Design a protein around this ligand. Structure first.
Ligand code: LU8
Ligand code: LU8
Ligand code: LU8
Ligand code: LU8
Lengths: 291, 284
């Protein structure tokens, strides 16, 4: 059960993540901020589900809440992915067709796994999908991380579990209905459609790094060109809801059949009408067909 | 950077039920109690963990929290709750063999009242108000200093069903106002009154003591049904017998009055935990 904390690989308002050693193997140890205690508990409820386990979902090892006197620590222990997040990976590396499709199909596979109920594992909507919440594995596939905001639904019992977490999604990735706060809060389909919007943005971030005809774009986050650094909720609402902005499709993509197919797919994630957006299953099937 | 010693040696099993098991364990020399939950009772681990993630209760008469642990296994999730270890065991265990004097009886019941009032009271700045919902002598531990602490917040409510033998009449007749937090406090007070009866029987006066018996031992079977309890408590309106010998002893006379005021059919007539404490501080 003993763990050695070896180096900090991330620190923010969320808390910190450490590379640690456990029985000679690297593990990731997240120490939550007290400010985010409700994410720790939610992530623990989600990882209680044995049938959540999947090659494209960050592997769970343990969760602990420890306390003496008035001090509490909140720990999550997972698999460790040395290559880091997709956000990290894309900064420095360009992609060929095979690697670009492998990445985006693996994320689609993880998301369809979350969204589809197993009769068990409830249907799950993530609510904070972004490139920092995706890890790159040594086999070139990715896995989805951070289930602290997740919503669960059971079709068998008609039960929607939205949890108790005042945390909201990463502002840059928020869907129009999240930014204008018109999202139907008691509708499970609404949360799936928020994930699809964010998936489209991650598809765009990845596709920019795929080389075609000797051309590639630099890594940029969604809406880099239209909002201030460290954008506020209102900054995002302006560009997405008032200005109706969507990420620009570089014209060089239209010379490449793969990037042309991906541009089509990301536009079907970005409809202002949530019910028009593709399902995660349809995205997975479309990416399985694209060459 | 730092070693995080998580190894707990499980040394002996001190409890096995439908809930799972409790073990005496060791962490880094320190004695701990480890409750390993059955799959049947996972929601009790989640509720106690959610409560402690909301408010880190620290009180001499509340079983001391150390850790909640979830570990992924091949094909299951393992759920452990780690607490302080009280080697003298539960009040239920303790009363079977031990008799009490006036000072030890009062110290036991005032320590319980103290833990219960701590749960019940909202503190601003603090803690939400908490009702226990399964108070009984098996959920109270005896400490070496003669005070008790309250255990098991798996059914707690902040502002599984309770043990049937200890259910208040409004729970048995399903009239409890479930939207009203004070209703849950009044259910705990009923159960406290039954625990006070269990303890008072074991207090010696004029060379006499009663044998340990659970509440309603004379009118319901072992593992009484909901119906068995409803008929006794709601339809016939029976209450535990106060033996004549108590009325020769000023302490037991005062405790009989106190437990009567926990057992009113009308929940709003019952004493509060704070008023029980004050009454107990004025006895002897
Ligand atoms: C979970 O339980 C037990 C834990 C420990 C334990 C082990 N290492 C470190 C600590 C610790 C050090 C420092 C801080 C604080 C102090 C300053 N503050 C402003 C912020 C940080 C908190 C915690 C503890 C408490 C020991 C125990 O028993 C001896 C425990 O009980 C079984
Ligand atoms: C998103 O969320 C969670 C992630 C992880 C996690 C797991 N493997 C590896 C990592 C990682 C390692 C290394 C880097 C490098 C990248 C580039 N380099 C310049 C700096 C550092 C980045 C990331 C992480 C962060 C664990 C979590 O919990 C334990 C997470 O929370 C659920
Ligand atoms: C994850 O799991 C378990 C962990 C432990 C445990 C073991 N050593 C040290 C610790 C510790 C406490 C507190 C800090 C502080 C230091 C100061 N800083 C400002 C904040 C952090 C660091 C380390 C813990 C919590 C025990 C366990 O069992 C008794 C665990 O398993 C349930
Ligand atoms: C009620 O609930 C919980 C209780 C405890 C707990 C804590 N200290 C000591 C005990 C204990 C030790 C020893 C004996 C007996 C063994 C044989 N003989 C009769 C002598 C004595 C009984 C009891 C327990 C059971 C821990 C819990 O969680 C970790 C509990 O759940 C919240």
């Amino acid at each position: 059960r003993d763990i050695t904390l070896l180096e900090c690989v991330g620190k923010g308002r969320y808390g910190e993540v450490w590379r640690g050693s456990w029985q000679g193997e690297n593990v990731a140890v997240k120490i939550f901020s007290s400010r985010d205690e409700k994410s720790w508990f939610r992530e623990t409820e989600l990882y209680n589900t044995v049938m959540l386990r999947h090659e494209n979902i960050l592997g769970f090892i343990a969760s602990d809440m420890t306390s003496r006197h008035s001090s509490t620590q909140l720990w999550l222990i997972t698999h460790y992915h040395e290559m880091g997040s997709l956000y990290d990976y894309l900064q420095l590396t360009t992609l060929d067709t095979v690697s670009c499709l492998r990445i985006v199909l693996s994320i689609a596979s993880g998301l369809a796994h979350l969204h589809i109920e197993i009769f068990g594992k409830p249907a799950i909507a993530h609510r904070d999908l972004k490139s920092k919440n995706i890890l790159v594995k040594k086999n070139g596939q990715c896995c989805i991380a951070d289930l602290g905001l997740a919503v669960m639904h059971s079709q068998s019992t008609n039960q929607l579990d939205v949890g108790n977490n005042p945390r909201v999604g990463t502002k840059r990735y928020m869907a129009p209905e999240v930014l204008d706060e018109t999202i139907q809060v008691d509708c499970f389909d609404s949360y799936k459609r928020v994930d699809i919007w964010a998936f489209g943005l991650v598809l765009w971030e990845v596709a920019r790094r795929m080389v075609s005809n000797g051309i590639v774009e630099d890594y940029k986050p969604p809406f880099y060109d239209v909002v201030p650094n460290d954008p506020s909720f209102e900054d995002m609402r302006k560009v997405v809801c008032v200005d109706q902005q969507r990420p620009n499709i570089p014209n060089r993509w239209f010379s490449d059949p793969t990037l042309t197919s991906l541009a089509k797919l990301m536009k079907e994630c970005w409809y202002q009408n949530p019910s028009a957006r593709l399902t995660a299953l349809r995205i997975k099937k479309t990416l399985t067909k694209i060459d």
